Amino acid sequence: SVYTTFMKSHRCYDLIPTSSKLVVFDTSLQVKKAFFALVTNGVRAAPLWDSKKQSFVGMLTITDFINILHRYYKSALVQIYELEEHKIETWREVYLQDPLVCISPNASLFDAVSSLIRNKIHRLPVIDPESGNTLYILTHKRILKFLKLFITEFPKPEFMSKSLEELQIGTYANIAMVRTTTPVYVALGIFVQHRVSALPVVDEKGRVVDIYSKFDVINLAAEKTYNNLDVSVTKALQHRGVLKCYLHETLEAIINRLVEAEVHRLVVVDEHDVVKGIVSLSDILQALV
Amino acid sequence: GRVKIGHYILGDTLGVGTFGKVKVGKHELTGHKVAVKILNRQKIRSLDVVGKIRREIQNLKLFRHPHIIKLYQVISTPSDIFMVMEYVSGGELFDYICKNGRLDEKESRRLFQQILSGVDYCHRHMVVHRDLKPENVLLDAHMNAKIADFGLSNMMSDGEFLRTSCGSPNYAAPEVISGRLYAGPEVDIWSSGVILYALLCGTLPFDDDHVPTLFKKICDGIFYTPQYLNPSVISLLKHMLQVDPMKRATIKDIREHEWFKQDLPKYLFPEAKWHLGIRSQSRPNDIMAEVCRAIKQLDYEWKVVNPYYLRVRRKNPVTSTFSKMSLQLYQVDSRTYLLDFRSIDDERPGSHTIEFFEMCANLIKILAQ
Amino acid sequence: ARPTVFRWTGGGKEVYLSGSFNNWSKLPLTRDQNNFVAILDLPEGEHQYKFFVDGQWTHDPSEPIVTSQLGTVNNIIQVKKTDFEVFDALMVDSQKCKAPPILPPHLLQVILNPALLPEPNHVMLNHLYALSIKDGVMVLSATHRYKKKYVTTLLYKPI
Numbered sequence: 001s002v003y004t005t006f007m008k009s010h011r012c013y014d015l016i017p018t019s020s021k022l023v024v025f026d027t028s029l030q031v032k033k034a035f036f037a038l039v040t041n042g043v044r045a046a047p048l049w050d051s052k053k054q055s056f057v058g059m060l061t062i063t064d065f066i067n068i069l070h071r072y073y074k075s076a077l078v079q080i081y082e083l084e085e086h087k088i089e090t091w092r093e094v095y096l097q098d099p100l101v102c103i104s105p106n107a108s109l110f111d112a113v114s115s116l117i118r119n120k121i122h123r124l125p126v127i128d129p130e131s132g133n134t135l136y137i138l139t140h141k142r143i144l145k146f147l148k149l150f151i152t153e154f155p156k157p158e159f160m161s162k163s164l165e166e167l168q169i170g171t172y173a174n175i176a177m178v179r180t181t182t183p184v185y186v187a188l189g190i191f192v193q194h195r196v197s198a199l200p201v202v203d204e205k206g207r208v209v210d211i212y213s214k215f216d217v218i219n220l221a222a223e224k225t226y227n228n229l230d231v232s233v234t235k236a237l238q239h240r241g242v243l244k245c246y247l248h249e250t251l252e253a254i255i256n257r258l259v260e261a262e263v264h265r266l267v268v269v270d271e272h273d274v275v276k277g278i279v280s281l282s283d284i285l286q287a288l289v
Numbered sequence: 290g291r292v293k294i295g296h297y298i299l300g301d302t303l304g305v306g307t308f309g310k311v312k313v314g315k316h317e318l319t320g321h322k323v324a325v326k327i328l329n330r331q332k333i334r335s336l337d338v339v340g341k342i343r344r345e346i347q348n349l350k351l352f353r354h355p356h357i358i359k360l361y362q363v364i365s366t367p368s369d370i371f372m373v374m375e376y377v378s379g380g381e382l383f384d385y386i387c388k389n390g391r392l393d394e395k396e397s398r399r400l401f402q403q404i405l406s407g408v409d410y411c412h413r414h415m416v417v418h419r420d421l422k423p424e425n426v427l428l429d430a431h432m433n434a435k436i437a438d439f440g441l442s443n444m445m446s447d448g449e450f451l452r453t454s455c456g457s458p459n460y461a462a463p464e465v466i467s468g469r470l471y472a473g474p475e476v477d478i479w480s481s482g483v484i485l486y487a488l489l490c491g492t493l494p495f496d497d498d499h500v501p502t503l504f505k506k507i508c509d510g511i512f513y514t515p516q517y518l519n520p521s522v523i524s525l526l527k528h529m530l531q532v533d534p535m536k537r538a539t540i541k542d543i544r545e546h547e548w549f550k551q552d553l554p555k556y557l558f559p560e561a562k563w564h565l566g567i568r569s570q571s572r573p574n575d576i577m578a579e580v581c582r583a584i585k586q587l588d589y590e591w592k593v594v595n596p597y598y599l600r601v602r603r604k605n606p607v608t609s610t611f612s613k614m615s616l617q618l619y620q621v622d623s624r625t626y627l628l629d630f631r632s633i634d635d636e637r638p639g640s641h642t643i644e645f646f647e648m649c650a651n652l653i654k655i656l657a658q
Numbered sequence: 659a660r661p662t663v664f665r666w667t668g669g670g671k672e673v674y675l676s677g678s679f680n681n682w683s684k685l686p687l688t689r690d691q692n693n694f695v696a697i698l699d700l701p702e703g704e705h706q707y708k709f710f711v712d713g714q715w716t717h718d719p720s721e722p723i724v725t726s727q728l729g730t731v732n733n734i735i736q737v738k739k740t741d742f743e744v745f746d747a748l749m750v751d752s753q754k755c756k757a758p759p760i761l762p763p764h765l766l767q768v769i770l771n772p773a774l775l776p777e778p779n780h781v782m783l784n785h786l787y788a789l790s791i792k793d794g795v796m797v798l799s800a801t802h803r804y805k806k807k808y809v810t811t812l813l814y815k816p817i
């Protein structure tokens with residue numbers, strides 16, 4: 001593979017921006033304050049510092065919110081005590097009862113892509129070993145953006161010309177979906193038992209109307225509405241056009257589509273606009289490594 | 290009966306710079322001419338410029354700009370240090386403006402571009418040549434500007450300001466004459482501003498035999514613009530000779546100016562409220578007394594450099610790695626003061642930046658405002 | 659050999675340098691002002707020299723002397739290895755030898771007030787900036803540089 005050689009050569013540092021912002025939480029910080037700080041800072045992931053251990057113990061992401069929110073939701077008439085009064089350490093001790101993954105800026109973008117899939121994670125902290133400081137959080141979206149800048153300037157191979165059906169890339173079976181009527185608590189249930197980024201919203205018939213993502217869950221913390229999870233998936237999405245691909249659309253064309261609108265995953269819809277499959281940024285980078 | 294160094298016959302003393310004698314040098318066989326900066330070792334060690342000379346050589350050896358005098362080679366002897374440099378026949382730009390008048394808009398601009406380009410090259414290499422005057426701008430056979438004498442120059446370090454109130458009063462910045470702290474590039478801009486004036490007018494913008502009125506006029510940023518001066522350059526000079534360093538033009542802002550950009554040659558250039566530290570209102574001595582009482586109540590070894598500057602180090606309980614930081618007290622107003630916490634970059638561990646935060650957060654949770 | 663400098667500081671009509679290095683032959687020194695010089699190459703090691711300043715044989719008192727077993731007082735010079743390389747010589751030379759400042763306005767200028775921030779002035783790097791303690795939690799910040807890229811780390815720590 002010619003794209004795999006491009007990655008195995010380029011340093012992680014090159015992908016790091018000119019001037020980044022990094023939010024680090026002490027593990028002693030109350031978990032609600034943590035999720036609010038993510039929202040206020042406009043960041044989707046935060047390294048966690050155990051002052052007692054004097055090292056970065058892990059990452060706090062929207063999945064942590066999804067997990068507390070579903071493990072502990074009693075009803076809309078009674079407070080999620082655990083979410084309110086609990087430290088990041090108190091909740092991590094529960095959730096992770098039964099380690100930290102990181103790339104060095106000296107490591108190659110391929111090592112980074114491998115490490116992402118190898119551990120099945122979306123957020124990878126780039127840490128300089130000399131300093132021990134976390135520099136940046138390498139995402140799929142960013143790697144895919146950089147690989148797209150070169151894919152365009154460099155020639156088009158056989159795979160790029162081939163379709164998504166022919167090349168056979170992504171998940172097209174056991175597709176976890178929510179419906180219009182489905183409440184947020186149930187959608188959160190799916191996110192836990194299935195471990196997938198977004199849930200396509202379907203009408204009376206199996207046609208995709210919207211797509212409820214792990215990101216739209218960040219909004220509950222933003223609007224301070226997480227106390228009412230009984231609300232439907234559609235009601236929850238009223239705070240903010242759908243993007244779908246066809247099985248006969250080129251892999252290079254869909255690669256430009258995912259990067260052009262800067263989306264995390266494309267839905268494989270058939271001629272009658274019904275959900276037939278799914279293709280994520282994670283799968284695209286895997287297929288290319 | 291010829292006195293040689295390298296293979297050059299030492300000749301007439303061209304001048305005496307900040308630290309040494311400068312003499313001409315004519316190559317034994319080729320006739321090539323150099324400017325030889327002689328520095329007596331015994332004399333340089335008599336002042337404490339031994340480190341300053343080390344850095345000066347270091348910088349000048351790694352530079353190569355068409356408007357900065359080239360340092361060819363340094364020849365050490367037991368006696369003295371000889372700095373073989375490029376020689377320009379034209380001499381001082383200052384003397385040029387004396388003999389001939391002021392330069393025409395077009396000719397002035399040319400030279401101003403050349404100078405600034407070099408001033409930029411220095412800054413682009415963390416060097417701030419303070420003492421930038423037409424007396425230090427040399428000219429070659431083909432009338433090209435050549436920045437010379439880095440005696441008073443200094444390095445720019447991440448997080449630190451310079452103090453030295455160096456250079457002539459006429460070309461000096463108001464903050465420099467005021468002896469305040471400064472970043473570095475801004476004072477070179479002020480100097481470059483008076484050079485542009487000197488080029489277009491043939492006189493100095495800030496000048497007086499009554500030195501008190503000289504400094505008043507410098508600090509009031511007030512100068513005379515002759516009727517012959519083009520508004521576009523008066524605009525540039527007004528933006529360059531700002532008494533406020535924060536309101537002053539950058540090499541970036543100048544590169545963007547309409548008068549500058551005009552006929553500018555290709556080769557010359559490439560291409561929720563946060564608070565700084567804590568602010569105690571108490572007596573400056575009593576405030577630093579509290580940071581000592583506190584630095585001790587936290588059990589951290591320090592070093593008192595100034596009666597307002599400290600160089601503290603705390604042992605990591607886990608990693609066992611010694612981490613360093615610096616504290617400085619600054620006067621914000623007449624009634625209020627501020628304690629500035631700066632990280633000291635050392636030389637596998639935990640995390641330098643986070644450790645620095647936890648270090649600070651302690652000396653704060655036991656301190657004023 | 660290494661270039662050694664011989665300089666007679668003082669007045670004179672005719673000034674010569676006799677030395678071990680030239681079999682004590684009178685070498686004329688060229689004068690600039692009150693400094694008569696010669697730059698001769700000498701091997702690393704001990705050398706003895708004297709001056710013939712206007713009909714009188716002398717030595718530079720400011721320089722190291724040696725008195726002979728015969729009562730000959732000549733100047734001496736140990737030309738050391740470290741004298742030839744500039745950075746070795748400047749290293750050996752380095753070894754041989756209020757009111758509170760007014761706050762620079764550069765420090766009051768920030769990059770903080772999505773993830774992408776403006777390039778900061780080098781002077782504010784490594785400085786501590788903190789946000790007011792709202793709800794028993796202090797927020798700390800600082801911009802550091804790693805190679806040619808910059809990172810502004812925010813620590814959320816309860817107090």
Ligand SMILES: OCC1(c2ccc(-c3cc4nc(O[C@@H]5CO[C@H]6[C@@H]5OC[C@H]6O)[nH]c4cc3Cl)cc2)CC1
Pocket residue numbers: 292299300301302308309310312327328329332333369663665688689690691693694695697
């Ligand atoms: O061209 C005339 C001519 C000629 C060439 C050169 C020198 C000469 C002068 C020196 N003055 C010295 O030191 C004094 C003290 O410290 C001060 C100052 O100069 C350096 C500065 O730091 N070291 C010197 C070395 C030499 Cl070779 C003299 C005459 C051939 C006869």
Ligand SMILES: Nc1ncnc2c1ncn2[C@@H]1O[C@H](COP(=O)(O)OP(=O)(O)O)[C@@H](O)[C@H]1O
Pocket residue numbers: 044045057058059060061062063064099100101102120121122123124125197214
């Ligand atoms: N590098 C990492 N080291 C340790 N835990 C991690 C790391 N990255 C993510 N996690 C954990 O994995 C879980 C799922 O995270 P993730 O898939 O990255 O979510 P998101 O799609 O919002 O980025 C979370 O509970 C988070 O704490």
Ligand SMILES: Nc1ncnc2c1ncn2[C@@H]1O[C@H](COP(=O)(O)O)[C@@H](O)[C@H]1O
Pocket residue numbers: 170171173174175176177195196197198199200264265278279280281282283
């Ligand atoms: N709704 C979904 N149902 C089933 N699999 C999915 C769904 N969304 C994404 N996937 C797959 O889950 C894996 C990880 O995806 P992602 O979390 O989107 O990065 C990939 O193999 C996707 O194809």
Ligand SMILES: Nc1ncnc2c1ncn2[C@@H]1O[C@H](COP(=O)(O)O)[C@@H](O)[C@H]1O
Pocket residue numbers: 197198211212213214215216240241242243244263264265266267
């Ligand atoms: N296929 C899609 N079409 C349209 N919007 C989408 C799609 N997938 C995700 N989004 C939107 O993108 C956000 C989710 O962000 P993220 O998980 O970072 O990709 C939400 O606002 C979704 O509505």
Ligand SMILES: [Cl-]
Pocket residue numbers: 304305306
């Ligand atoms: Cl002079």
Ligand SMILES: [Cl-]
Pocket residue numbers: 376377378379429430431
């Ligand atoms: Cl010339």
Ligand SMILES: [Cl-]
Pocket residue numbers: 383386387423487491492493
């Ligand atoms: Cl003049």
